[PDB]
Design a binder for this molecule. Sequence first.
Ligand SMILES: [Cl-]
Ligand SMILES: [Cl-]
Ligand SMILES: [Cl-]
Length: 162
Amino acid sequence: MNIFEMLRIDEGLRLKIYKDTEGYYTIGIGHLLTKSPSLNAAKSELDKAIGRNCNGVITKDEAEKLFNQDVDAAVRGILRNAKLKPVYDSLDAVRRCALINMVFQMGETGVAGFTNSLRMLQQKRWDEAAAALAKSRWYNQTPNRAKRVITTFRTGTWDAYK
Ligand SMILES: [Cl-]
Ligand SMILES: [Cl-]
Ligand SMILES: [Cl-]
């Protein structure tokens, strides 16, 4: 099980524009196009992103090229961020995927706001961290994917995805 398989499980795969759980226009493997209400602002974002007139529809390969990009972006953003980098440095390989997950989903900034949780991860206090993470809107909005990730951090195993 790797980061790509973990996120394919978490976000699904869709070849036509769609709305995410928060109502925003998405495509492929949780690739956020726009926050804007405009289905038209979304088709343009899409074409900008693919480099073709897509008309809200893409291929699998395309969907995969975008995923490649986003995961890479997610990793480079952690490794560059002052609050995130030390945490990641301190983690084992499995818990590392867990922080990649959260960052792909909520961006660097939002994950960087979970101060206390970050602190307990870095200190290796698994149960405490799991407890704080849960006290979040994130947990309340997408509880199943959240518990999965939260379990990844508590355990250090792929149990929850297996
Ligand atoms: Cl926190
Ligand atoms: Cl809460
Ligand atoms: Cl969920």
